[PDB]
Amino acid sequence: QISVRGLAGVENVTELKKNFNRHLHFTLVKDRNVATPRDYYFALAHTVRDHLVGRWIRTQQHYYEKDPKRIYYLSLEFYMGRTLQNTMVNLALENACDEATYQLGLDMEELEEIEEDAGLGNGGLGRLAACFLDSMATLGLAAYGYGIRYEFGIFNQKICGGWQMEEADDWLRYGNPWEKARPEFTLPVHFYGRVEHTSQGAKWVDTQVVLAMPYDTPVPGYRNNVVNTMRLWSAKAPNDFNLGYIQAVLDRNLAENISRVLYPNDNFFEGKELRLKQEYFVVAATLQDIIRRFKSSTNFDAFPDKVAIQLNDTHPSLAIPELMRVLVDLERLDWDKAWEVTVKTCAYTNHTVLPEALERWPVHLLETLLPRHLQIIYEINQRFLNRVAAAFPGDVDRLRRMSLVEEGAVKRINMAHLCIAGSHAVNGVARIHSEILKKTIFKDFYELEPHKFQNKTNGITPRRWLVLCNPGLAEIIAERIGEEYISDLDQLRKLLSYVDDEAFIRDVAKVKQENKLKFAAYLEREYKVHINPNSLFDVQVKRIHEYKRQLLNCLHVITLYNRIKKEPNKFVVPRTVMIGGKAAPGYHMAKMIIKLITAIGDVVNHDPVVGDRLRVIFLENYRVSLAEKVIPAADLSEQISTAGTEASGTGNMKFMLNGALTIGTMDGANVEMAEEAGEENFFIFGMRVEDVDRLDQRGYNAQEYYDRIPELRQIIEQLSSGFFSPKQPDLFKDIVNMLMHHDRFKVFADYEEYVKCQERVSALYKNPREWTRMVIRNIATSGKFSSDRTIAQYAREIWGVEPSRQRLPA
């Protein structure tokens, strides 16, 4: 149908149809008379999968022959979403499959909706890992993603009576056609036990053994015939485990619980034993696999020349003492040599500065679970602090501040300090964040080893986040500038030449209108809720957190409502305000915020005086596949975290690529986005980091804002008095109390500037031509935020490898 979706040659279409029918018959054991649409989805998935396998085998064979340096990306989260369309895009099969299925009497878009998301992540950090795998394959790197195959990913969110309910995400129920179990490469992982000292060093003995069984998923590059591997570990009990009889068999679940469920915490540390087991499990199985692959090529001097290990946050930080354990206890290298190898192999990416997110494991936990690793951590600490003492003699407070061991009520290990000591590179995820790391939380470490500290600004893959989710926009762009931008996003800069082109203006605006109608239709059919498609689509989608300030958005919504009620017959730009995202099940305030959003909706959406001028929708079950629908439909992107709290953001970049304008603070990657587009083409408001610091030194007093802003006072009075909860007048007392007395994120301090900035948005939206021109300026300068740029920087500045755009033979 459309050019970016590839060729539909008669030979290819015929072959796809034959293979579809073969899988339906032989693989699924169905005929056309009994087949459900789910069976048709599976027949298509297996047909497309067949096209991957040749390239997958040849890619891995190629890496064996050429022996390049291998990149190992260690993450506890891979937020993959659906695989079918992404695979078709990267293999240039989309139009052919569309044609083949049409001829079989089927709608491919309908079949695509049947696939479950691989929801093996929480939010930004998890989705970053997924975008990165796509870029690494596209750039021809010998890269492997290593993680856990969770049986249950991020919970499915249902809204009942305005409240979040959690349901198990049983994503493997119907099978996963993309994975290949590899039980032949099963590896043992050890837990508990004790340390024995011989004349030949330490021995870790009397351990409990859990098996790690790998499952491999293909990761296709964009049209280069490269197919890399994501290897995810599943926990299995040994067959003599606990071996009255019946109970011993049932107790196998105790071992296998390690890979059962993703911890649903986003930017929050929960110090639970099962989480620690997951962290060690992924690390121990991965490192054995790495060493096995290295040895098939006892000289560990060349180890850092053949292996890079990237730690996604501190979650796999145990890689550092585990590598030391293997090199020293098993391979019998001396400490200093092993340490040199370790440091040169490992690199660490920090994702947040929020104190409650930092992993600080109780010593007593590590002592029981991982007694040898604790000894190694103590030894690392002693040697590191000796270096600190020599560099800064007599500075006793620095010693205390930099220690990997934290003193207190409970002794803890600071995993971030372990990662810095044991890595040759430490990076933040946006320029402002990397600067904050050097100035504040890691200042001491930066003074000791300035060379370790880098920036690598986050990015997103333009495959999933443009071509896949917004084919209409990808096409109108391709018509003018060709197809090369899909793997070289900087080429979007050529679009600045069309900012005064009347044909292009009309096409950009038409693509947006079509996306909005399609999403408006989606909401009716699937959620029985009506929206006006002519309204400004005002969208905030991301995990629910106090720092992200969904509450500030709520205050604006209520302000707009109060202004309409005060002057009903005055013209206002119509808005659909959409907020979506999950709260961690134990995060009470975030759960209260969701209830507030729905309660506001209950009032606003049913008030006849408002009409269709304002609508407030909570988008249920926000996840990757929902993002692919809502982002192309958005006019306004809400990126309103308190300055200095959102390390980068990536949702911000997705909206910019897809033709929404941004209202945002100077936080995270927003700063770089505004710098790329021009500040005049962005809706910037609020305190800068420096303003927040100044307010903190003086002391934040919320009462002052309440006293001075009559519109703010009225909202607080409405909240307190039960206006939004008539049957439970004090329902929102916790929210009011937090805002008035202990708001860490200074919601009130940005309220006035935010409301005023929102008026400027409404003014611009009244002039469609000028709105669209600003949109064009945003799309045209979004090139920097491709994860291809990010990965090329990691490859050159951290991993010491050259990216390649060259095709492997088909």
Ligand X SMILES: O=c1oc2c(O)c(O)cc3c(=O)oc4c(O)c(O)cc1c4c23
Ligand Y SMILES: *Cc1c(COP(=O)(O)O)cnc(C)c1O
Residues making up the annotated binding site for AMP are 31, 64, 292-297
> Per CB under 6 A, does 471 bind ligand Y?
no
Out of 627, 666, 677, 739, the residue judged to bind ligand Y by CB under 6 A: 627
Looking at residues 429 to 458 of the shown chain, list those that interact with ligand X (rule: CB under 6 A): none
How far is residue 388's CA from residue 409's CA, in Å, rounded to a whole number?
A: 25
* 351 classed as catalytic: yes
Beta bridge partners of 308: 71
| Distance of closest approach, residue 495 Cβ to ligand Y, in angstroms | 23
Of the listed pieces 351-359, 387-395, 521-529, 622-630, which binds ligand Y according to CB under 6 A? Answer: 622-630
> How far is the C-alpha of 678 from the C-alpha of 174, rounded, in Å?
48
Cα–Cα distance list, 622 to 27, 167, 176, 687 (Å): 33, 14, 22, 29
Q: Which residue among the candidates 49, 417, 654, 773 is catalytic per the annotation?
A: 654
Q: Would residue 612 be called left, alpha or beta, if left means φ above 0 and alpha means ψ between -120 and 50 degrees?
A: alpha
Strand 208-220 and strand 187-191: the pairing is antiparallel
Q: Which of 649, 664, 686, 803 binds ligand Y (CB under 6 A)?
A: 649
624 binds, among its own copies, ligand Y, ligand X, none (CB under 5 to 8 A by kind): ligand Y
233, 453, 587, 754: residue in contact with ligand X (rule CB under 6 A): 587
Identity of the residue, 744 or 756, whose beta carbon is nearer to ligand X in the bound complex: 744
Cα 323 off chain centre by:
27
What part of residues 541-600 is at the interface with ligand Y (CB under 6 A)? Answer: 542
Which own/partner contact pairs does 268-276 have at CB distance under 8 Å and 24+ positions apart?
A: 268/356, 268/357, 268/584, 268/587, 269/356, 269/357, 269/358, 269/359, 269/360, 270/586, 271/360, 271/361, 271/362, 271/365, 273/365, 273/369, 276/361, 276/365, 276/366, 276/369, 276/370
Sign of the dihedral through C-alpha 709, 710, 714, 715: negative
State whether residue 723 is helix, strand or coil.
coil
HSE on the CB side for 549, CA within 13 Å? 29
Q: By C-alpha distance, which of 62, 198, 251, 17 is closest to 810?
A: 62
| 591 a catalytic residue | no
Dihedral sign (CA 65, 66, 71, 77): negative
Return the structure tokens found at 146.
């290593």
Output 463 or 543, the one with its CB closest to ligand X: 543
Tell me how far, at minimum, the Cβ of 720 lies from its own copies, in Å: 30
Q: Which of residues 568-587 bind its own copies (CB under 8 A)?
A: 585-586
Using rule CB under 8 A, residue 246 touches its own copies: yes
Q: Token pair for residue 75?
A: 């993450």
Annotation: binding site: 31, 64, 292-297
Distance from C-alpha of 52 to C-alpha of 40, rounded to nearest angstrom = 19
Pick the closer one to ligand X by CB: 452 or 545.
Answer: 545
The dihedral over CA atoms of 792, 798, 799, 800, expressed in degrees to the nearest 10, equals 80
Return the number of the residue (645 or 650) whose C-beta is nearest ligand Y.
650
Site residues for ligand X, window 350-409 (CB under 6 A)?
356
Q: What does the block give as tokens for 638?
A: 């809400």
Using DSSP's 3-state secondary structure scheme, residue 770 falls into: helix
- Work out whether 734 is an interface residue with ligand X (CB under 6 A): no
Comparing CB distances to its own copies, the nearer of 185 and 335 is: 185
**Active site (annotated) includes residue 443:** no
Q: What is the DSSP string of 15-34?
A: HHHHHHHHIIIIIT---TTT
548 is a catalytic site residue: yes
Query: Known catalytic residue: 352?
Result: no
Using CB under 6 A as the binding criterion, the count of chain residues that bind ligand X stands at 11
To ligand Y, the closest distance from the beta carbon of 722 in angstroms equals 32
CB of 229 to ligand X, least distance (A): 31
**Chain residues 530-549 in contact with ligand X, contact rule CB under 6 A:** 545-546
Residue 516: active-site member: no
Q: From the CB of 113, what's the least distance to its own copies, in Å?
A: 17
Instruction: Name which of 583 and 795 has its Cβ closer to ligand X.
Output: 583
User: What's the angle, vertex CA 65, arms to CA 62 and CA 68, rounded to 5?
Assistant: 80
Name the residue nearer to ligand X (CB basis): 591 or 688. Answer: 591
Per CB under 8 A, the list member of 3, 36, 534, 767 interacting with its own copies is 36
Catalytic residue, candidates 314, 650, 772, 790: 650
Question: Under a CB-based contact definition with an 8 Å cutoff, are residues 634 and 651 in contact?
Answer: no
Q: Which positions lie near ligand X, rule CB under 6 A?
A: 265-268, 270, 356, 545-546, 584, 586-587
Q: Which positions lie near its own copies, rule CB under 8 A?
A: 25-26, 29-31, 36, 38, 50, 53-54, 56-57, 61, 152, 155-156, 165-168, 170, 173-175, 180-181, 183-184, 216, 236-237, 239-241, 243-246, 249-250, 252-253, 257, 260-261, 263-264, 272, 274, 585-586
Q: Which positions lie near ligand Y, rule CB under 6 A?
A: 123-124, 127, 542, 623-624, 627, 649-652, 654
**Catalytic (active-site) positions:** 351, 542-543, 548, 650, 654
